[model samples]
Target: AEPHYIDAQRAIAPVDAPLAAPHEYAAVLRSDFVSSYHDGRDVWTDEAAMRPASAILHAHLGRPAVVLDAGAGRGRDTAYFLEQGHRVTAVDLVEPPEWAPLAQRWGERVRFVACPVSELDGEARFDGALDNGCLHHQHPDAYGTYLARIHALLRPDGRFTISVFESDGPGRLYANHAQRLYREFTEPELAELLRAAHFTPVDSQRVPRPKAGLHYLVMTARKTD
Candidate 1:
């Protein structure tokens, strides 16, 4: 198969002059993604953030919900969904090496694939989906490919839940915690973007946390005809 590129405006810098990273909004290939582990420990330090997000999805699941863990990264939430007895298929641009043992232990209950959401294809195969701070970070051009891919992966009536950095307001959009650029959506922009993705909104809310972190927009939606 031919190579497929997701970001329409994306261009990688030459081997000799790569963009410096660990700085705000670098978008450098390979080094762009911030590791979800620091000194070999899981970076999902907030069970408060993870708890509600997990509850929202589990509340929406029905029977054997096959979940799509978009940008699964360190598999923190993936482990939760699996323990809840839902089958999960996780994807990321690159798989973390530490997942080898986890995958071995989880066995057939989970499957890990390496690829971005746009290139990640399936047989219209998922009943439940998760967007763990992806999508809105993408360049505008990537959304069309992403939307179609999401629709193709989840059949009608399938559900989706996402968590994204909330824009304080217009023009406040900037580098996220990972130092990668996120096209932070103001309230109205998110509504417009959700419609563009063809997912029907179920609920949306702004969640705030104290002690130095930005607030988030948590949402749930469903596929419809």
Candidate 2:
């Protein structure tokens, strides 16, 4: 298969590169969640009407499951989780002021932790977890631990929604913002990671991001202990 060639490379990193202070991601990120790639797109189309994560989260609604909003920026999904009748511990490095309403509105059903993804201690042992855009920033060195912690934090039957940029072929890599884009993956690569992380891949989708001229690989997985 040919490699992803939409945008020209900025700075490419290999698939097996060691992480450079993955814990410092918080210190070098934008405070807000505005997408450079999602402009003028029907974001909700990918949420559930198109992907399995939202659909499953809806299918099993009112279980009031305790879920992890991993890298929960601005508490958008946090609020959505609560509205669906669940408890959420939204974790992030920079606490956006936009999250205040969800905390106020949901009260005990929501908790916000301001910290890097790596520093989060999984004492809560969530029923499920969600990592929408967080995994794309991580290299293999740090991603393993992130995946491991998600595994430790979930129930035996936990479900997860993980998404990242896809290379469409072998994969793509380039640096932007203040850090490296790390590496992107093809569909098979994502499925392998889900299996290795102890989550069975239930379903997946490759949706286009028109503004970014790229595609996202969103996979829904479940734990079977």
Candidate 3:
């Protein structure tokens, strides 16, 4: 299949360059997000600022419920949800070193699936979904598939929380071949996408990571029946 290209206006650079497929794109070395890991001894260290933001998602989830930890990289938030007594299905393209220990410790409470968000299979019954830093990295063409899968995985009125780079403009999407591709979504753009996928936005908050000079937009959307 031919790789698709994004509009110049929506991208930061190399708009002429065709975007890669999810499987092809994810194979490239990740950006700073995965930079902290060395060998199998370390985990992503930049998650300090992510804790408080993660708490917001936990609060909106059903107590002792089933949760979808979409793009759960190192199982940090997956562990968090498990600790709170929720059954979690953590999905990721690449299995993290932390998965085994988490599975051994938590037993059936957590299961890590090696797959992309668009390919995740099963029924729609999760009580809530949490995406710490996943959606924005998807290909533009995959947005619908990504959101649709999440929507289909959840029960009616199930909650979905997302954390992503916040765009200053209407939107900013790009691919750093040296790293990977990602989109910085404006509030309106995100809302429209969620609504189109049958989700209702309930909250949007901007969280800044001063140390990395990055700003994340955290939004909570409810699945609408």
Each model's Cα RMSD: 8.6, 5.1, 5.8
Q: How many residue pairs clash in each candidate?
A: 0, 0, 0
Full-model lDDT for every candidate: 0.65, 0.66, 0.74
Worst 10 residues of 2 by lDDT: 36-45
Higher-ranked by lDDT: 1 or 2? 2
Compared with the true structure, model 1 gives a TM-score of 0.77
Q: State the lDDT of candidate 3 residue by residue for 94-190, as single tens digits.
A: 6767899999999988888888777788767698899887787776777788889999999886899998877766666666434456677888888
- The local lDDT score (0 to 100) that residue 216 gets in candidate 3 is 76
Query: lDDT tens digits, residues 140-223, model 1?
Result: 456677777887898677888887756655623333333344555666677667777787778777766433255667788887
Q: Give the TM-score ranking, best first.
A: 3, 1, 2
Flag the better candidate by TM-score, 1 or 2.
Answer: 1
Error of 1 at 24 (Å): 16
For candidate 2, write residues 70-179 as lDDT tens digits.
87766667777788888888887656666787777988888888876677775537877888677776655677888888888887777788767777567655555435
User: Model 3: residues >4 Å from true position, as ranges?
Assistant: 1-14, 21-45
